[PDB]
């Protein structure tokens, strides 16, 4: 299964992310 | 540090305790185990003529012209290395059932939950309401304080 | 009505089926209903029937 979070959290918990080994596609809306 | 690599995996199999072995690199401390402990363990005996001849080498480099000193109990080396273990410590095989959490408007077809919390994003409202469109969907809501340890937390368990 | 629907011929009367979801089972019984507003039309039923 897949989600959908804001990308101000994922920016924020990115580390975690990648601690765990997740795939994540984000957009930087500048 | 110890001088072999047999005793650190000896003590690794009894505690678990990752202790360096010596390779000449400064004039360090080192730690060294006699007849008691080596009973103790149950070495086999062709490690004490590693060991032995692994000391009689450093006397004879303190004849040439470093600190070595030994252990003589269970209980004092348990406080020489100053840590003990948890024992088992499985590792499942991956860290958690989702595999990818996106934002991307192209994904929302594809996507399977959704979290929500108020959020600076410019096309927030647009994925939020082509997620909750679709007819059987799994929607978490945040309720203030802290979202961060909420989403870790959800991250997690799900 | 229930010999009909087994037997699949409905002679007598029709019921009528309905779509719905997976998680609305979940929700319904995580949910209860109870009354709060009453039939407005129910003082003058007995008379459109008539």
């Known amino acids: 299964a897949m989600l959908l979070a804001p990308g101000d959290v994922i920016k924020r918990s ?12 984000l957009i930087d809306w500048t | 540090v110890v001088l ?3 005793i650190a995996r000896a003590i690794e199999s009894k505690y678990g305790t990752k202790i360096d072995v010596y390779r000449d690199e400064v004039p360090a401390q080192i730690i060294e185990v006699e007849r008691s402990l080596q009973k ?3 070495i086999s005996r062709e490690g004490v003529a590693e ?4 000391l009689r080498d450093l006397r004879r480099k303190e004849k040439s012209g470093i600190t070595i000193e030994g252990v003589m109990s269970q209980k004092k080396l348990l406080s020489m290395i100053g840590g003990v273990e948890r024992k088992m410590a499985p590792i499942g095989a991956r860290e958690s059932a989702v595999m990818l959490v996106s934002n991307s408007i192209k994904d929302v077809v594809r996507a399977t939950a959704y979290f929500t919390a108020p959020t600076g994003d410019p096309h927030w409202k647009e994925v939020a309401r082509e997620a909750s469109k679709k007819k059987n969907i799994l929607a978490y809501t945040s309720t203030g304080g802290d979202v961060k340890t909420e989403f870790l ?3 997690d368990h799900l | 009505l229930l010999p009909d629907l087994i037997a699949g011929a409905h ?3 029709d019921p009528v089926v309905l779509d719905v979801s ?4 979940w929700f319904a ?16 039923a007995p008379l459109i029937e008539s």
């Open chain 1, 14 to 25: 990115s580390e975690e992310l990648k601690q765990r080994q997740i795939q994540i596609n």
């Open chain 2, 40 to 42: 103790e363990l149950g």
């Open chain 3, 22 to 25: 997976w998680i609305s089972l």
């Open chain 2, 4 to 6: 072999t690599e047999e």
């Open chain 2, 153 to 155: 937390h959800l991250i």
């Open chain 3, 11 to 13: 002679q007598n009367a």
């Open chain 2, 51 to 54: 060991q032995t001849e692994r």
């Open chain 3, 29 to 44: 019984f995580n949910r209860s209903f109870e009354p709060t507003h009453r039939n407005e039309m129910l003082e003058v």
